[PDB]
Structure formats: C-alpha cells, structure tokens
C-alpha cells in the first residue's frame, strides 16, 4: 500500500552539537567589527551565485558570464539551452500582459 | 520533492468509511466510493 509497516529508524539527532553550535557565530561581521569586511563575503558557497540573487533566468545568466569557460561541453550546451529557453520564457506567454 | 504526498491510506480510509454498506465493486475503491457516497450524503 502507501504507508510504512513499522516505526521508522529512530531519529537520533542531537540538536545541540558543535557543527551547529556556532551557527552564525562571528556572522554580524560588518558593523560589529569596525567595517573591515561585510557579511557579503562571509558565505562559503559557489562563486556562480555568492550573493547576487536574481531570477532563474538571471541565475543562469550570472552562471554563464562568471564561469562558462570552465565547464565541460555538456554543461556549456546545457546552460546555453536553458538560457535560450528562459530568454524566450520572460517576454512571450504568461498571465500578465 | 522536498516533501512528497505521504498521507494517503489515512486519507482514503477517511473517505470510504462513511459508505461501507454498499453493494458491488464499489465496496472497495476510492473513485466509486466518492461518487456514490457524495450522492448519498
């Protein structure tokens, strides 16, 4: 059917462990540190999208203009494909016109 | 998903348990149940 059969694995999760303990510690970095470095650098994440959060089409546009010459050919053709798709997607057919 | 539709057997048993006194194949399945039970209420 569509249910489980027994009670599932017991969710051993310590909500108070170290790798979550400092979650945002030293993360008011800018005005609480005499303006040396903004929070706009403290994020450890991909350089395609580290803090210019536009739309989906914008997301891909930034991915291209940042790292396109660093992809295998499948990713380049893929990013080009969806970029063409989205450029057609924005201004063609929708609810508000 | 980031969440799939998990409450089905509870939903269907909420559906069919107010019409379990019928006859024919509609004693069982949700589509026949909804049609006849809706008519009956």
């Amino acid at each position: 059917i569509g249910i489980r059969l027994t009670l599932p694995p017991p969710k051993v999760v310590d909500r108070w462990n170290e790798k979550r303990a400092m979650f945002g510690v030293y993360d008011n970095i800018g005005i609480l540190g005499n303006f040396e470095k903004h929070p706009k650098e403290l994020i450890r994440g991909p350089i395609w999208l580290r803090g210019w959060k536009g739309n989906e089409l914008q997301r891909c546009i930034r991915k291209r203009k940042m790292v396109g010459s660093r992809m295998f050919a499948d990713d380049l053709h893929n990013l080009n494909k969806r970029i063409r798709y989205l450029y057609k997607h924005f201004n063609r057919h929708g609810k508000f016109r | 998903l980031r969440n799939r539709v998990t409450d089905r057997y509870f939903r269907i048993q909420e559906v069919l348990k107010h019409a379990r006194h019928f006859r024919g194949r509609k004693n069982r399945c949700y589509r026949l149940a909804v049609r006849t039970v809706i008519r009956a209420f």
Binding site: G2, I3, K11 | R4, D7, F10, Q13
Partner: peptide
C-alpha cells in the same frame, strides 16, 4: 517511500486498534 516520521505513527496507532479488535484481551 515517504521520508517521514509521523504518518507511520498514525498507521501504527490504527493497526494497534485493529490488533485490539482482532481478539480482545481477557
């Protein structure tokens, strides 16, 4: 294969009621 921890408990409660109705204890 719903990744979830509650609806299981709901179905377990229903099945336990079914077990009670299966043969009531002395």
């Amino acid at each position: 294969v719903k990744k979830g921890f509650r609806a299981a408990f709901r179905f377990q409660k229903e099945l336990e009621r079914q077990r009670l109705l299966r043969c009531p204890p002395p």
